[model samples]
Target: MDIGINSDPNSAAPAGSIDSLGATGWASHGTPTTGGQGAAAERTYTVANRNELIQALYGNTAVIAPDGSVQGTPDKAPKVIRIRGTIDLNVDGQLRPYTPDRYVAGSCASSVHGYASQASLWSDYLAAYRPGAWGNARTVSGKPEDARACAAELQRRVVTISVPDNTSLLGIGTDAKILHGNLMLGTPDAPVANIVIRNITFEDAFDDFPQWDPTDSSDGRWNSEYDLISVAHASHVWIDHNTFSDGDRHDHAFPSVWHETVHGTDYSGGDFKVQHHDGLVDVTRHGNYVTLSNNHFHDHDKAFLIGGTDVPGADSGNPRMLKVTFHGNHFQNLRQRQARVRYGMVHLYNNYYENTRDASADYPWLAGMTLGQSGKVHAENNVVSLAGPDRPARPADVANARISAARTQDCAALFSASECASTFYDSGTVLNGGPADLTAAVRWSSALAAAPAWKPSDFYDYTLEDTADLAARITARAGAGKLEGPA
Candidate 1:
């Protein structure tokens, strides 16, 4: 197949093809069909600016009054939201050029120290917002005309584009960008179905207000508000060929307090930094039948997660039966959680994991594939050399290679760590519904592939490529800067 060009419809479905695995199209489990019907022939709504994009989402103008009053409700949902130029939410009336300077100027209102002296400014702003509380709680300063009001409004204006069922969001150009806010799929009560999001550049959808928890991990941690794309209780979703990262975000976003000076005196308290950024793509709250393919995730702490939490209650009613397929994607320079599984039957195959190294002192880069909360993950043909040199070149040992009893038992000390033990995967097959005899499934001969009962192919069709060829194949075609056609 030619790179970036969809010349043959028969040769491995196009980059943005919502079609599922198998001979037929759109084959998924737990709700075989997802997204809008007749999407190929659906009407295309072109969105150039923030309001038009908002109007395209809800099918009505969410009029923002000068007094910060929102008049109309979001009612209309379109099938396809086609983006052309860079759509920046921080700016009003017009779209701006994609530049690093714009992001550094606090355009998204997410970055705190984009420029030098901005950190102290953010500290004062946040202090005023939450008086007497430095870590948690947001309290309004009694002043009526406070500058904090501007920050509050700016935070509010970073709107999350709610996607309804059967919608296809297509980016016309390679530079089509969605800056600041996220694109949310569905809520817990309102579940969206049959969605296709492709070929768009999602940059710096950072949440300005993050919760500071002193007891988050061994060290303190700050939790961000939103991800670039959050899929909650949604099914039959396809996210392909998109680029997600902190655009032009420099060291300030992940600043280190280790080398700060007070009164011209050096201080080394070992407080590295607080990364208030969330995942790039997160599927949670019983989200099912999703496929994340041919996308690029880089330069972030949390990249992707399936199943929101490791709590036992969230796994009740087998809600973690989230069926997902992650194939042909490129996970580059990410610290951890290439696909952190939690109660989901996730198949990760033919993907590229490059520079899977750790940069944080608090939390080490554990593994390329992390199986937690008893989540079932079938990993095949993924390139990861993090495991000791003795590990096989191509192996399905996500548990034996990644999980340890110590890491599993002491997981709470780590930030947002999930419950994972060697018992989760005996040999390579998931031991969730399998035999209780862990000793029997210890060796490679008795692993997942050797187990005749279940396989990833039973749920979805897949052609696993060699890990050696994965990098070449994915780099040539994955990410936002690709040649793609209309959805």
Candidate 2:
């Protein structure tokens, strides 16, 4: 087996070579080489249809029944599964229709045939239930029973594919698609390790039912229950060359709500809106040592999140370090959380970010990269192409607009309030203040100092030549439909 890091971009190949974009911090640490063994040698399984794929993944005994169901125990084998064609979970209109208050109230206005608008549903939902009272609509005096039923139906449709350890789930080509289904990597109690997923397009793995949090922040953040790909307490995993998107449905997902256009006493300008869909790729619950590369995240809000939530000392108390590498990824027309790092030593490099103007005020609101909750992030050689009327005065302006880029919960003692800001410096973009000045001005608190420090040479063994050309390179090479192998 040929194993080595590649520095030459012209000849750099995806297989058996590192990202060729360079790695740093803990992202370069601990099992840098992921999915070393090719799937061709492993116990191979080919899944042509959805039922066959589901059976191979979830069936226990692996006995092929007459009806295509693998009855008995779940398959917990170390093997490689090759997927072809489209594996749609919403086959034969199987996904339960969401017929809530919005549908009955004529809020859809024939624009959408099915699915209720969250605006109409949320208005009634707020009226029926209180923030503290979730999942208990029966307590309300005049509850929307249909809306409640719709929510229940959505909750029941959470189909997750539980993956096992020492396995590789590779697509035959870029056309291999998984629609409206989630891949749950590991559970909270048991974490899977050494897994690889590549060359697949995961589209519309959305959670129609979302929980409303009153105290998310000030105005509150809408939280979705499911993700396209969720990694929980897993390690040494590689997710590469995949496409994650909601397609033209992104506008519908995050619509601007306007009960009244003008700013009023009761209502402000217009709620920029929150989405029901969760992250495209979410690494949480002490999931560490993951290398996410060459993937395209488009038309989504909350593209990627490392570590856990911003709740102080939540996942931080787990004692397990979440070290993730996000490199050569293309983030197109996304809203925020390009890489929201919290309590993890995350390294972001050679990523391409292209913002869209049409979505709303909240669209592209957050920085291309953000560090929060004592999270130490090392960012370098990344590109951001901003569009629309409002171009930020500086890269720092873009970075600082959404909560000052780096946010630490309790770090007032170590450095001054101004000095203790989140540290993120990119060497690729030529900023006004310069890279060295940005790095020198930043300082970490004593508590945050516990994270692995950032050093270029200590982390990466090799480096690419022209880092500025990464954006175009990543856009061409990253994502689904670009798989290289014998089909």
Candidate 3:
């Protein structure tokens, strides 16, 4: 396995592979995202299981010091971790596989979340938090709340993993994956830079205890607590050549939120529990200089969100341009927010967008390439197509695929924050086998303020792929397991 060449027939990088900062568009500006490229052999790790994967990185618990000695805090040194195959993050610290039937505590009497005699009983949790009983309450507190807190603490230890500075996590081959886990990048308080995560499949990051709120909307919704990958206050990072999806654990498997008819009125709102899962890859809290290329996102609702919050001062200083790039990727069977931006100068090019569901599935329109608060998008040479006649999904995905500058229909605070303003530059875009000006195609909402558009060449240099061959090119090599090996 060469460091920067792929000889495999199935690999898209047969000619050359994406080395550190090689394809990182914005992250390559000043401090290139060269994550652990030249680490000492002693620092390089090959991980096969969850516990091994945990020890490979700096987890703030026990860490491997520079001199190969055991230490308390991470040394924050350059390190590379390679995954051999599937690593289930749901396993206990001792590597015992966790199942739904198994109680979080082996010592518990009912094998539920809290101790057998504790207040966090499953029956009590549902009873205390039901919409009909709670009745328009926004937050919850009580004995059951105490139980929820206890379960959350145990669940966090089982599911969350930290990714620190100067770290490169790679899949050994096409089969590498991480299941039932959330990877947290650095936060604003302790920022990390120069990180790269590539060549892996991120399976469902399910939340067993999704909190149900009665005051979330006209009828409340259940909210989960994790994303497959969370990037916050981090910089100079590259996330490429990976797969993100709900996998076999799609939200459709879950029933609607709990509600009982009271006073001849529907309490639960009859909507499915859509919040059991959150975003796939969320870049927020001033995480900048990031590039996402050659990836596959499938069967998701909220796929990717830049600048997670909708506050006015979120992107105050930077007016219309921020550096983030989406190139040579596949968005399939997704509902909305292919790349919803806020204070982001995102460049989208050479990507494929496909929807298996019909036009009225998620919303009437505005589900693709969304331009949220203060967000700016420059889209070129992209293909947006719905499922063909066999499925008879929609008229055309391009009507709103290339540019959607509208506010989402929801009472959640984040949905309304998108009403501030946005800018879009659409060129060389194809939809339903025809060239289109997506900016003009969409019926721009009055709530959104229009701003000046920009181009990629203005600030940097780049080349556009032929849109005619884009679908075939992107679908062929845009995801994981295509790489030859370590390179």
Candidate 4:
């Protein structure tokens, strides 16, 4: 196997040899605030000549084709890569720059070195879930013998270093601050044993924004169609410290639009542009251990999502996405109730939700949390809130939004209720568990309480406003409602 860090003079391809070939670039190219699409000139450089540029980078951030020289993808040269964070090869650069305390020391999905083109393909493949792949929802079964399936699996899953069960995967941020991103771990058979995502921000991601054809009839439904982070058919995972949002700002109480002229098409925003890739971090199909803790979720459709097999298009089903924990996270202003939690004997506790929103015609209202045909879903100490006084309070509209605004809790919408109502009835607490209608209210009652009054940075910040009066009443009753626990 050709296993050696590229660009190291000690290796086959000498250092400067690549320089004359075309090396000269920056590590982090600030998204020049002025250039609103079509302004910045495309830059290109190679790992050899970009010594100075490389020195400026911070952590083990990938400074490949798009993120560095360009943004994500170079439309002109589709095969080109870019950079987002930074890294250094020279000894003068920190030999071992420590990942943030919260950022565990393991390979991030982007850290899959040398597979540059494959990585780019992986990114686009994931983006497709929002607008493309209409024919079917692809599934990555984690079967190593099937590299093709592995490539397809990268669409919805973040593949990183392999992790064993109960392992303390690396993290970022100060020990105190929350961190968040995505993770992949372990083999498919034992599925989840080695992945954990925490302490970062996930926002403004949509079904098809970063890539999609708005003219397509399916564009608008993107936001309500995917997840922020998902761990499935695998085990040992954790997700936290993330905020999620889509560009669903509205005018006069109606959703508004932000336009971009990509390839001459005035693509107005339908949802946030980022999506959570799916399934077992490793290529084995077995479910593994996982954990998602202390993260903040906002501005997206679904916050924390989980599933096993029941997904319609992806025939890859798991009876349970077992052994996981969802704790101390916050969910706010989920404009569209678009998350699902199908299976897993997972624990959902101490998650908070506020100022939630749901669009009926496309995005379903919330369903705080529901069990699937099999697998176990547990919830405790979760808070819920609506985004507007005018919004509906059905579990789908204003509650935790999904099972818990926990993205997995919301992912249930992806499946038809006809396939899930039985699980609800079987769970015994399904709140009526009648008519399997995914759109209408399921059997539910006062499952969520109002959030505190809030004034968001933007006018669309109606979530806090939704429960302003109720929050006031609660404050009068209990002096601020601050649980003083995990937020």
lDDT of 4 by residue, 1-487 (tens): 5756664443232211111011001100111111011212232222221222232121123333321221121122111112122222111122332221101112132333222343344444444432233222233222121322333233222212122232221112222121122223433454433223332333322222122233334333222222334343433343433333332421112242334444343434434333322211111123334444445544543444444344322324333224345445554444332223444344544445555334433333344454433334444334454443463354443223223333333344554332222222111111122211222333342232112121111111111212223323332222111211112
**Candidate 1 wrong stretches, greater than 4 Å:** 1-27, 30-43, 64-78, 91-121, 125-157, 250-253, 258-272, 314-319, 356-366, 385-454, 485-487
TM-score of 2: 0.72
> lDDT of each structure?
0.56, 0.57, 0.68, 0.30
Query: Residue pairs in steric clash, candidate 1?
Result: 20-26, 34-194, 35-194, 35-195, 36-166, 58-76, 59-76, 343-375
By lDDT, rank the candidates, best first. Answer: 3, 2, 1, 4
Backbone clashes under 3 angstroms, per model: 8, 7, 3, 99
Task: Pick out the ten consecutive residues of candidate 1 with the lowest summed lDDT.
Answer: 426-435
On lDDT, the candidate that comes out on top is 3
Higher lDDT: candidate 1 or 4? 1
Candidate 2: count the clashes.
Answer: 7
Better of 1 and 4 by TM-score: 1
State model 3's lDDT.
0.68
All candidates: TM-score: 0.69, 0.72, 0.82, 0.41
Tens digits of per-residue lDDT for model 3, 1-487: 5555654454344212334446557777665678978867766888888767767775435653221223345436787788778898877656776654333343222443344643336568678778667766468777666655555555656677777788888777767889888988776567778888888899898876677666675566777888998877677888888898988787666766465876555654435364668888887766777888899988777788876654444333133224688888898877777887776778888889877444434322236776665677788888887654344333223434222343322212332343334667778887768777767644343235364455667766667888998898888888887764433
Q: Which ten residues in a row have the lowest lDDT in candidate 4?
A: 20-29
- Where model 2 places Cα greater than 4 Å from the true spot, the runs are 1-28, 32-43, 59-74, 91-157, 252-274, 311-319, 356-365, 390-393, 401-425, 430-452, 456-462, 485-487
